[PDB]
C-alpha cells in the first residue's frame, strides 16, 4: 500500500485539492469575520472548517509515511505541521490565542503554492547575511534601552520606567514615531539634556539601518 | 475619405492642437476652483468646458477610422476613450464623483506626449516583477487584518471592529504613520501584549517592503 | 592695473582672505542671534557686517573686470554676485525678509571653496535626469489637488479649501506625516470613501519616489 | 617576567575570561534595572560589580606592559582604556551622570569579539566618504537654524527662540516627525508664508540625504 498512496500523494489532483482547500478556509475565514454572517451561517462553517482541518491532519499523517525523516527535515513540511497542530489544539482551556492563532493555516498557500515559496526563500535567504548587523544592533538597543532607563524611569516611567519599558520607547524613536513632539520634547521639560541622548540615538540607529540596506543591495 | 482623414489624424498639426487643449483645459480647471473666478467667468468656462469635450469625441471618433481594431488594442488609446467617455456623462444623476474625474482628463497631457509616456511606462514594467511580491503582502495583510478584528475589535472597533478597518489601520502601520502614540499605546492600555502583535508586523511588513525596493534597484 | 589687479585677484591670498571673512562674518551671525550679546556688542557687530559688505563688493568689482563677462556666465560668481547684491539692501526700506536672507550669504562658503564645488555640483547634475519624473509628479500633483478641492473644500476648507492649500496637504500626505490620524480618518468621518482617494494617492507617489531613488542609484 | 605575562595576556583563554565577564556583567546591568530585584540581592550586584571593574583594570594594565606604545595606538584599546576610565570614576559626585556612563563598558563586547569589529569598523569607513556631504549639510543646517532664529522666535520662542533651538525643530522637521501638524501648519496660522521657508528646506534635505544614501550604495 506504500507505493498505492505514495502515488495519491504526489498526485498534482491531491496537491491541487488542497490548495483548493486553503482558499475556501480563507474565503471562509473572512466570513467569520462578520458578528452578521456568523449569526446566519455561522454553524455552516465552524463545521466546514473542523472538517479542512481533519483533511489536513489527514494529508499530514498522508504525507509522513510517503516522507518519513525526510518529512521533519523539510521546513515547508514542519511548518504545516505545526500550523494545523496550533489549528487541533481544543476551543478551550489555556490561553485564547490559539483560537485566534488558527488563522496562520492560510499561510499554507506559502508553502502549498511554490514562486511563494522561491521568493519566501528568497527573502529569508538575506537574514543570515543580517545576521552580523541585527546584533550590533541589538546590543546597543539593550545598552541604551538600560542607560535610558536609569536616567527618565523616575519622572517618565510610562516612557522608561521598565526596561523592557524602555525598548518599546526606544523602538519607537528608531521607527522615528511621534519621537520629538511625543517623547523628547516632553523629557526635556525635565531634563534639558535628554536631547543629547536621542539625537546621537538616532544617527546610529539610522546610518545602521542605511548600511543594512546598502548590504541588501550588495547581491 | 480614408487616405484624407488618416493624413489629418496623423498629422504634428492635429497632435499639437490637441496638447494645445489639455494645457489650456487644465488651466481652465485650476481657474474652476475659485470660487471668485466661477462668479465672474463660470460661464466662459463650462462652454469653453463643452467645446473641449466636443473637439476631443470628434478627435477620438476620427481616430478610431483611421486604426479600427488597432486602436482598441493601445494601452494609451484605449484610456483616452475611457477618460473621455468619463467626461461624457452628463453633469446629473448617479454620483457626482463622475463630475470630479472630468480632471482625469489632464492625463492626456501624459497619453498626447511622449517621454512622458517614456517615463510611465518605464515605471509600470517594474510592476510584474513586484507581482509576486506585491501578491506575497497581500495575503499577509489578509491574514493580519483577519487576526487584528478578532483580537481588537470589541474594545477598539474604530481601529480594528470591522475587517475592512483592520485593513486601513494594517495599512497606517505600515506607513509607520502615528502607530505607537496613536494605536498600540492606546491598544496595550487593555491588552498588554499587543506589543506582540504589531512589533513583528512591523519589522517583516518593513523586510518585506526593503527587499521590493533593492529588487528594483535589480531590474 | 589691468594687470596689477588680475594679479591681486587671482591671488591664493584674495581668496583665502575672503574665506577667511566667511567664517568670521558666519562666527559674528551666529553671534547675532543671541538678544543678550546684541546688547553688549551689537555696534561692534553691526559695523563688523557693514565693514565685510564693502570688502565683498570690492571683490565684486575687481573680479568683474578681471573677467568681463567671463563672470556673467559662471553660475557661481553670478551667485556671489547676487548674494552680496542681496546684502547690500537698505536695512529700512522693502520686505524684511530681505534683512534675514543676507544670511545666505554664508553659502559664499560653498562659492569660494572648490571641494565643496565639487560636491554641490555633484547633487545638482543628477536633477536634469530627474525631470521627467519630477514633472509627472507635479502634474500628478496638479491633477489631485484639483480633484481633492472640489471633493473636500466645503466641509474640510482648511485642509482643502484653495487649490493651494490642497497641494499642502497633499505635500504632508505624500511625506507620510500624520496623515491617517491628522486628514484622512477626520475626513472619513464625513465622506467614508475618502480611503479610496488617499491610499491610492499614497502608493503612485510612493512607488514613483522609489523609482526617482532606484534611477539616481543607477546614474 | 615580561615574557611570562606577554604568554598570559595574549592567550585565547585570556580573552575567553574576559569575554565570560562581559555577558556576565551586561546580564548583570540588565538585572540592576529591577526595583524589586535591588532590594533582594542589591549586594550582590554592587560588589560583585565593583569585582568586575578590579579585573578589568588588571587586565589593562597587564595588556598595556604587553603593548606599551602600541596600545594607545590602536582605536580598540583607548576604547577600552576610556571605558574603564570612565567606570573606576567613584560613586560620587559632581555630574551623576558619570554612574550612567558606566553601562557603556558592555561595548567591550563589541571590542572583545572580532567579526563585530569587522562590521563596526565597516559601519565607520564609510564616514570619511560622507564628510563631505556630511559638512555639506551642517553648514546648511546653521545657515537655516540662523534664519529661522530671526524669522519665527518672537512668536514661536518653543520652536525657535534660540540658535539651538531652531537646530533641534529643523531636525525635527528634518528626520521629517510631526513637521506640518506640529509646526509648520501652527507657524503659518502667523506668518502664513512659512511654508515658502519649510517645504524648500525639505526638498535639499530629503534629497542630500538620499544622495548620500545612493553615494553610500557606490562605496
Ligand atoms: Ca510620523
Ligand atoms: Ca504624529
Not at 23 to 29: A, K, P, Q, R, S
Not at 44 to 54: A, E, H, K
Not at 135 to 161: D, K, N, S, V
Request: hydrophobic fraction near 55%; proline fraction near 4%; include cysteine.
Amino acid at each position: 500500500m506504500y507505493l498505492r498512496i505514495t502515488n495519491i500523494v504526489e498526485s498534482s489532483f491531491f496537491t491541487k485539492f488542497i490548495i483548493y482547500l486553503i482558499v475556501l478556509n480563507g474565503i471562509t475565514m473572512g466570513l467569520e469575520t462578520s458578528k452578521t454572517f456568523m449569526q446566519s451561517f455561522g454553524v455552516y462553517t465552524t463545521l466546514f472548517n473542523q472538517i479542512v482541518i481533519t483533511i489536513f491532519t489527514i494529508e499530514i499523517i498522508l504525507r509522513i509515511y510517503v516522507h518519513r525523516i525526510s518529512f521533519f527535515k523539510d521546513p515547508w513540511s514542519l511548518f504545516d505541521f505545526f500550523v494545523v497542530a496550533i489549528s487541533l489544539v481544543p476551543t478551550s482551556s489555556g490561553f485564547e490565542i490559539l483560537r485566534v492563532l488558527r488563522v496562520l493555516r492560510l499561510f499554507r498557500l506559502v508553502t502549498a503554492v511554490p514562486q511563494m515559496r522561491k521568493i519566501v526563500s528568497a527573502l529569508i535567504s538575506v537574514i543570515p547575511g543580517m545576521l552580523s548587523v541585527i546584533a550590533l544592533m541589538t546590543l546597543f538597543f539593550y545598552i541604551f534601552a538600560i542607560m535610558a532607563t536609569q536616567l527618565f524611569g523616575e519622572r517618565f516611567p510610562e516612557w522608561f520606567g521598565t526596561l523592557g519599558e524602555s525598548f518599546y520607547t526606544l523602538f519607537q524613536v528608531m521607527t522615528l514615531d511621534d519621537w520629538s513632539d511625543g517623547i523628547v520634547r516632553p523629557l526635556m521639560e525635565v531634563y534639558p539634556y535628554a536631547w543629547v541622548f536621542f539625537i546621537p540615538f538616532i544617527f546610529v540607529v539610522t546610518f545602521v539601518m542605511i548600511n543594512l540596506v546598502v548590504a541588501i543591495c550588495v547581491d
